[PDB]
Design a protein around this ligand. Sequence first.
Ligand code: CLA
Ligand SMILES: CC1=C[C@H](O)CC(C)(C)[C@H]1/C=C/C(C)=C/C=C/C(C)=C/C=C/C=C(C)/C=C/C=C(C)/C=C/C1=C(C)C[C@H](O)CC1(C)C
Ligand SMILES: CC1=C[C@H](O)CC(C)(C)[C@H]1/C=C/C(C)=C/C=C/C(C)=C/C=C/C=C(C)/C=C/C=C(C)/C=C/C1=C(C)C[C@H](O)CC1(C)C
Ligand SMILES: CC1=C[C@H](O)CC(C)(C)[C@H]1/C=C/C(C)=C/C=C/C(C)=C/C=C/C=C(C)/C=C/C=C(C)/C=C/C1=C(C)C[C@H](O)CC1(C)C
Ligand SMILES: NCC(=O)NCC(=O)O
Lengths: 99, 219, 165, 41, 192, 192
Amino acid sequence: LADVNLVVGGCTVGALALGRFVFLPFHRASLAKAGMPKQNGMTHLQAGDARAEEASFILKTNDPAGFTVVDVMAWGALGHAAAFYILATSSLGLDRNPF
Amino acid sequence: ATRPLWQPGVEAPKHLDGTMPGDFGFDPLNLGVNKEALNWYRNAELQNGRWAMLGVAGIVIPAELTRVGVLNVPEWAEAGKVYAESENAIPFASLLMVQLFLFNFVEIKRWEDIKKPGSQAEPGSFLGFESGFKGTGISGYPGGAFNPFGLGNSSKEAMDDLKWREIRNGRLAMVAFLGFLSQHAATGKGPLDNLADHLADPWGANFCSNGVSIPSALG
Amino acid sequence: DVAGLTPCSESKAFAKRKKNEVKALNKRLKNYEADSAPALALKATIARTEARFDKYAKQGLLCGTDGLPHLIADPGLALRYGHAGDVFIPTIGFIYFAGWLGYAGSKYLQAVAATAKPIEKEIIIDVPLAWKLLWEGFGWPLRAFAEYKNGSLMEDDAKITVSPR
Amino acid sequence: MKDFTTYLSTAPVLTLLSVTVVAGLLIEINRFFPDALIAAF
Amino acid sequence: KAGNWLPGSETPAYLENLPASYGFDPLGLAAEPASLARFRESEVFHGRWAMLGAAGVLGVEVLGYGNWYDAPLPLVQGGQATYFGASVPFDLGTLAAIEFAAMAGAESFRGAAEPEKRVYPGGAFDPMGMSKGNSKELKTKEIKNGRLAMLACLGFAAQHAATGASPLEALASHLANPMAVNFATNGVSLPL
Amino acid sequence: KAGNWLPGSETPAYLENLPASYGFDPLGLAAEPASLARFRESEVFHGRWAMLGAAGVLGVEVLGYGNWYDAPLPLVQGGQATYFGASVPFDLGTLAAIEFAAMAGAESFRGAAEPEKRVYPGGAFDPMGMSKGNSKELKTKEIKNGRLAMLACLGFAAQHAATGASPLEALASHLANPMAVNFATNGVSLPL
Ligand code: CLA
Ligand SMILES: CC1=C[C@H](O)CC(C)(C)[C@H]1/C=C/C(C)=C/C=C/C(C)=C/C=C/C=C(C)/C=C/C=C(C)/C=C/C1=C(C)C[C@H](O)CC1(C)C
Ligand SMILES: CC1=C[C@H](O)CC(C)(C)[C@H]1/C=C/C(C)=C/C=C/C(C)=C/C=C/C=C(C)/C=C/C=C(C)/C=C/C1=C(C)C[C@H](O)CC1(C)C
Ligand SMILES: CC1=C[C@H](O)CC(C)(C)[C@H]1/C=C/C(C)=C/C=C/C(C)=C/C=C/C=C(C)/C=C/C=C(C)/C=C/C1=C(C)C[C@H](O)CC1(C)C
Ligand SMILES: NCC(=O)NCC(=O)O
């Protein structure tokens, strides 16, 4: 309940930096372990779902660590959700404390 | 094998051979057919017998000494409340927990004996005291620090004799303690009170007159 | 009181029920000479009813909004309120007697299985053997726990026949 | 005799006899200790 | 090994070469190798965190700055929590955010490392060069102190949840008259 | 040996060359070599602590500063402990702290040594060099005086727990009336 601008901007920038610098190794490791979904041993693309063909605007990026635009959007979505949790919770003024 | 049995003419079951002390071939319910269960029951009988001998002593000896005029301690049933109402008395819950915490250690030690009868003698267990726990080859008879006077620690058959004396006295003590419990539940008097009462009128004062043994509904 | 249930010795509805049931039996009495067999039967019935209602009040059973005794089926919430004779003690008593009968039957089966004609010793029971095993079944907690700690109570599924999945 | 006692050991007779004995026992217990709702000891 | 928790007993075979091992595994939770490796790492890390936690819980009270339970309360229902008597100008939101960022960075760096370097990474975490001269013995000391501190932190939590005191206050209360104010006297631990 | 505990008997074989040995082992507690090798050092240390304790109990009372029991009373009661007459302004907690630190480092230095060095350390603990010159007789001296002091300290504790008096006070009360002021007369020790 103190400046939507500061909290949402700082939270989103912090979440972007945290997903680009901190959580990126584990994120990439888990993504490499998981991989594209498979039905009966073949990806949905091999089976014939040509709409399951991987979006081209993510295969090659220009970020030196491989941070694609969709990664940016997921991490920004998490950052905005956390920031608006902060705002909406600080806006309330009720005793939730179990004491 | 040819020893006296509980029923003369009834042969002993072919599992109660004749090696255990106190063996009279008594086992109508066949509870000890399994050898391992028989060892556990032997050990249980030893524990029950020893605790019952201690308890029956601590019941009759204070009672008879009170009767003649010394020590004037209460009767065993109310002795719990007599202490409990004292001023600096430990609360019951804390007292029971202290007792159970000590007996936890002691009885788990005896347990690990019962499994492998040399378990607790391994070096490095206690602080040099582990040697006194070596056992004597049979569970329930530790020796060592136990048995300080070395009674029966001589002729083997001497130890066998004392084992029969111990087991007979323990069986008597457990029967007597069951008697004390059932007598105080029926007649709210002490053991010596019941004894001196029965001798007064054996045909009038017995178990068929207290009205609790034989159900009043029937009569 | 354990859950809004006042002891039947206090509940007014319990005594009211006692009163009404006795009054019904009195109305049934008021038709016979109080020395005839029907009159004696009615008087015995009334005495039995009064004894039951006094016995229930003495033992401190819990009566509800209506005047009917209630029972408690939770150990701990019945052991700290003096109501263990309601379900826990009869639980022990049943479990014991049921186990006694089951163990006697089980041991009889295992004893007559190893004979010449096991299918014959089930329709023509051997009464002395059945009676001996019925007597040995009283220690069933001991013997059953011995066989479980021994592993001889149960049979490994590699030897029990099964269906083709 | 031996065959008569064998007949008395048959399932039809021994079952009926045991049910009669247990029934009689429960009837006697309820006759002397009636209306027992709880295990009051 | 050195130790056996149940002297007369047989220990699991997978628990031998481990430092500070006593064969203590009655539930067989280390019957598998990978599971046991993860458990070993987690035990050491838990021991370190609980040593820090127990040291803090004792040192906030022996130094005289309130007990561990009432330390976060002032931040709520007011603000500016106190450290050493001072006052941070930070609220719960910024505290949570800064902790989340810093701990995320630290534990993401730790978690991405090699198996053994995830639990015993000397490098710059041993400035005093003590990992030399056979660290096995040192590892045993660390594990046993960690076990003691873990049990102590759980004890803090349970004692405060039962009697509502504070660690040193409970200590003094028990010392004053042990035979009648142990855990068996409160109406919580013992349902009597 | 020099001693037989029971004039006629057969004594444990392992007790022969020890200083001040009387064959006293009817319980077989030191049968294995390690148990005896630990118990010797334990007994010697127990004896030295006893000698010092008995010296203190006699000295705190013979000089005129009070009992051996009331020693720790001025620790609470508001405060103020007396030592010869000084104030020694040290509260209860710092006493435990200072003594724990001192005894921890001292007992962790004396034990971490070799078994002979753990009980009979020449070094600076024999400044007057009486450790040489046939030390077996002197070892017997030390052990027997230690046994005497152990029983003395046990008697101090027991007679205080029975009559409530003091060593010198109990001695005076006995010497005045040897006849009706014994252990047999206070209704604690002898009951019949
Ligand atoms: C002594 C014989 C005996 C024994 C030990 C068992 C034991 C068992 N039965 Mg079983 N059963 C029996 C006889 C026996 N049954 C008979 C004769 C029938 C035909 C009616 C059944 C029909 C039956 C069914 C349908 C089921 C079981 C099930 C079970 C298991 C669950 C326990 C239970 O409550 O069962 C319940 C017991 C009954 C339903 C009836 C009991 C029959 C009488 C009371 C006992 C017979 C005693 C015998 C005649 C006397 C011989 C004594 C000797 C001296 C001669 C259990 C292991 C259940 C299961 O699947 O396991 C989980 C199951 O669903 N039984
Ligand atoms: C052999 C057989 C086999 C077959 O086959 C089958 C059959 C038949 C089943 C069988 C038989 C059985 C029997 C008989 C049993 C019984 C038992 C008992 C009685 C026990 C007790 C047992 C008992 C016991 C231990 C006891 C103990 C006791 C005690 C401690 C006491 C204590 C006390 C005292 C001092 C005093 C105080 O004031 C109180 C008290 C606290 C109380
Ligand atoms: C091993 C095994 C195996 C087998 O087989 C089985 C069995 C038996 C199960 C087992 C056992 C187990 C156990 C015992 C466990 C336990 C654990 C614990 C206690 C933990 C804790 C643990 C704990 C921990 C870490 C803790 C930590 C802590 C902390 C950080 C704290 C912090 C803090 C402080 C400073 C103060 C302030 O004011 C607040 C806070 C902020 C809060
Ligand atoms: C040998 C044997 C072997 C076989 O086999 C078996 C048998 C026979 C069992 C045996 C026996 C043994 C024994 C007798 C033991 C005992 C011990 C003791 C008494 C110790 C003390 C011990 C004791 C001691 C040290 C002492 C302690 C004390 C002290 C230091 C002091 C302290 C103090 C002082 C200064 C003063 C102040 O104001 C007070 C106080 C603070 C209080
Ligand atoms: N290895 C240490 C050792 O031997 N200690 C003996 C003792 O506890 O005094």
